[PDB]
Amino acid sequence: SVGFGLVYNSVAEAKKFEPTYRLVRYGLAEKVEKASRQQRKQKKNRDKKIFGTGKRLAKKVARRNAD
Amino acid sequence: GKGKPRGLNSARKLRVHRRNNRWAENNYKKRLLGTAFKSSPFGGSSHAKGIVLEKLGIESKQPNSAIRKCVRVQLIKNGKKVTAFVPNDGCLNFVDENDEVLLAGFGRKGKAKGDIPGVRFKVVKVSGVSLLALWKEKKEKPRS
Amino acid sequence: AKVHGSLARAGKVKSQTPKVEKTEKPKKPKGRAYKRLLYTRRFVNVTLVNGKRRMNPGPS
Amino acid sequence: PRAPRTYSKTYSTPKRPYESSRLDAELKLAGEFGLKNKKEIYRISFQLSKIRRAARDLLTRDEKDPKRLFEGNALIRRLVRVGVLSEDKKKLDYVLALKVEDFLERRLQTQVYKLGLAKSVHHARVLITQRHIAVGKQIVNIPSFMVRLDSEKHIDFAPTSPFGGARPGRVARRNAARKAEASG
RNA sequence: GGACUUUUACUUUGAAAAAAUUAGAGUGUUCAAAGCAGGCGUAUUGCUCGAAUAUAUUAGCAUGGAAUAAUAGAAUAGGACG
RNA sequence: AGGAUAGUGGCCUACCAUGGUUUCAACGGGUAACGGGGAAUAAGGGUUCGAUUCCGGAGAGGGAGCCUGAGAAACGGCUACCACAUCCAAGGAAGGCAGCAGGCGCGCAAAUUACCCAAUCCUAAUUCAGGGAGGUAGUGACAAUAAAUAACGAUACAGGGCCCAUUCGGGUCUUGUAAUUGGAAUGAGUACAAUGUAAAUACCUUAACGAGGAACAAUUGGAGGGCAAGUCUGGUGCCAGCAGCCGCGGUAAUUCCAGCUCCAAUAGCGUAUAUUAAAGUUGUUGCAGUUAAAAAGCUCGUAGUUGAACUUUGGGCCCGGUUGGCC
Ligand SMILES: [Mg+2]
Ligand SMILES: [Mg+2]
Ligand SMILES: [Mg+2]
Ligand SMILES: [Mg+2]
Ligand SMILES: [Mg+2]
Ligand SMILES: [Mg+2]
Ligand SMILES: [Mg+2]
Ligand SMILES: [Mg+2]
Ligand SMILES: [Mg+2]
Ligand SMILES: [Mg+2]
Ligand SMILES: [Mg+2]
Ligand SMILES: [Mg+2]
Ligand SMILES: [Mg+2]
Ligand SMILES: [Mg+2]
Ligand SMILES: [Mg+2]
Ligand SMILES: [Mg+2]
Ligand SMILES: [Mg+2]
Ligand SMILES: [Mg+2]
Ligand SMILES: [Mg+2]
Ligand SMILES: [Mg+2]
Ligand SMILES: [Mg+2]
Ligand SMILES: [Mg+2]
Ligand SMILES: [Mg+2]
């Protein structure tokens, strides 16, 4: 078998330079759990329709659903 | 001097002479006049789908006594009426009527094939089921 | 020419023929083996070299 | 969008399909060298046609032409390497005059047959396909391999196979297991 | 730097003609189609060859030749030399 | 001359003149026409194709206009008209898949409403976010590459020499044939694992399982000629049907329907259409023109094509290159 190998002078260098998927393969770091890609995209597009934070129209629709 | 000009500045003559004498050909003429796209019930296509209207007992040309079991077909894209030959023993009994058949040419570049006068196409499919397969009993025809 | 006729006789012979099922035979070799078989049947075996090296002659 | 992969076909069908002489010669070659296809012979004829076209294009030129010298010496070297052309024949005309059999004799199948180890070209083909040889100590399962005249000495059975050792084999193990359980 | 300076066609050489494709050199994709890789050591520290070349019309650019084929020159000498 | 433009310019305006293109094919029409790099086929010359991985151009349902900006006549940006068409508590509002998937139609004719930024690269205030660009897998016989479907013995037959040369006695060695039989070998296929990967799947490795035939069983076309391979059997009887062409078929079918055998290519084979070669049946290379198709009735003549010979040759002297050649 033939492959490629890297050996760093330290571990902080490795944790700053190596990729996260490889650190995860070696068990040093943890894969941050992420929502699926189109889910993130849908959320971003839902947020794009909001101007500001959302509290104003939140309480407004709370008020207006009684209307 | 064999007719044609040989001079070193006589190429235009040769070109335009070739153009005219190329029109004297058959394949060039059909290709450039666009007869396939303008005529030839297909659109210069390899195949064409059509709807059966009638079954026919076309009599063969001489010297040959036989009846050739063809069908009339209205093409879907053009609406043109076309006679097509159902090639095999007993395969007319899969083409009952109002079927949607696929037609191909026979192989003579638009001419009529043999003892069959006037037909230039053959049936390859009925309802998408391959007359060859139906005849060899590999598949069966749908209900409708 | 006459386009009509009588479409009743369609399938006459195909219907009349008595059906005869294939005899089950030992499977023939396939590929390099079949080429070996042919080479033997023709060149090292002269099986039928009557005058002209026929391949599928009639029994006589 | 991406750079396309290049591809070529390696064989050419002959113009006349049914020529009894050619058919006889082709089948004789197939029987002598253990082939399943006329495609193999077509492939060798294709390679040979390319080589001959190159040699003609060079021979039409002048000798001492740099292109002729370079490419002809390269072709000659590349053929002498696989032993298709003897070191007695290095003048670029025997290249044209070679044969199909000169190529076809260098296949690892018939080369195995020559170097013992198979006692038949069909046995050699199945041995190759069944992994029981190694050219260096590298395993090959292709008959069309074109030995380079320096691996010819290194052809041998494979270490990780029966006839090279370290394990008997599946059916032998089954037979020995049946024998051992019957011994009980 | 100047006085000037017959005009072309033709042909040689060169530059130019994207890359991929084409032909083609070298080379392990296990062969091959391909790819542009890879190979060699005491493999403990490393060393190193490459990724060529050719074709690419016609038009234009420069260049040598100057046959072949055209073109012009001094003739009521407002002709050349000085 | 002015205006306009980022700038040149009838780009536009005023005044003036009457020019400009054209049988060396203008202008107009057609194109089943985006152009090239290139592709197929090509002895050579050539013919055809080129929507399509690169370059350039154009367009964003059709037209037109315009804001912003360095840059757009922008359309995943506005404005209007046309045509399509969506939601309405009918007052009004919102639209542009020739981006990725996907769906109706159109049709002979073309894939998943999937995963990911790990790679290639791009944008941004920027190592960090985003990217249906792009890659990854799925469907996929478009095309291509390599290449399994069996191999070897021992017995029973049929050969060809050599030892005995003692009738026909043995046969050593051989190339094929078997309701013979043996043990070997193997991968397709399952699969702990590991590798692979962004993560998987596959590939390459690899424990264990996984050939003996009624199994892990290769088709596609054909057998009159062209054109490889039947005068074999049964059926029909100018009928059914085959047949690219010639032809077969009318009660003894080598051509139809089948069986057997055989042949060709073979995980590929056939059919249709188009195109290339064959085609020196487009003819520059390279056709033909008395009779086979074709010399205009005859002469003159303008775009063109073609056009007699002649002008520095001959002789010498040197220099140094490439091949050779004893050595
Ligand atoms: Mg001339
Ligand atoms: Mg006739
Ligand atoms: Mg010039
Ligand atoms: Mg002005
Ligand atoms: Mg003006
Ligand atoms: Mg168009
Ligand atoms: Mg189009
Ligand atoms: Mg645009
Ligand atoms: Mg649309
Ligand atoms: Mg717009
Ligand atoms: Mg859009
Ligand atoms: Mg789409
Ligand atoms: Mg068959
Ligand atoms: Mg048949
Ligand atoms: Mg024959
Ligand atoms: Mg026939
Ligand atoms: Mg038959
Ligand atoms: Mg030719
Ligand atoms: Mg002729
Ligand atoms: Mg006459
Ligand atoms: Mg005549
Ligand atoms: Mg006359
Ligand atoms: Mg002249």
For the record, the structure tokens of B112 come out as 């009529």
- What residues of chain D, 16 to 75, have a C-beta less than 8 Å from chain C? 27-28, 30-31, 34-36
* D4 within a domain of the structure (yes/no): no
B47: how many CB neighbours lie within 10 A of its CB? 12
What is the total residue count of chain C?
60
Q: For residues B14 and B5, is the Cβ–Cβ distance under 8 A?
A: yes
Count of domains for chain D: 1
Range of the domain at D29: 17-184
Three-state secondary structure call for residue B67: strand
Listed residue (B76, B34, B37, B20) closest to B53, CA to CA: B76
Is it the case that chain D and chain C have 3 or more CB pairs lying under 8 Å apart? yes
| Amino acid code (one letter) for B79 | G
What is the rounded CA–CA span in Å between residue D111 and residue D107? 6
Listed residue (D151, D150, D149, A8) closest to D140, CA to CA: D151
Listed residue (D167, B67, A63) closest to C10, CA to CA: B67
Smallest CA–C1' distance to F238, residue = B65
Of B61, B67, B89, the CB nearest to C6: B67
For the record, the structure tokens of C19 come out as 């059906």
Q: Tell me, in Å, how far CA of D136 is from C1' of E37?
A: 22
- Which chain D positions have a beta carbon within 8 Å of C32's beta carbon? 34-36, 122, 125
Angle at B100 between CA B97 and CA B102, to 5 degrees: 120
Q: For residues B58 and C5, is the Cβ–Cβ distance under 8 A?
A: yes
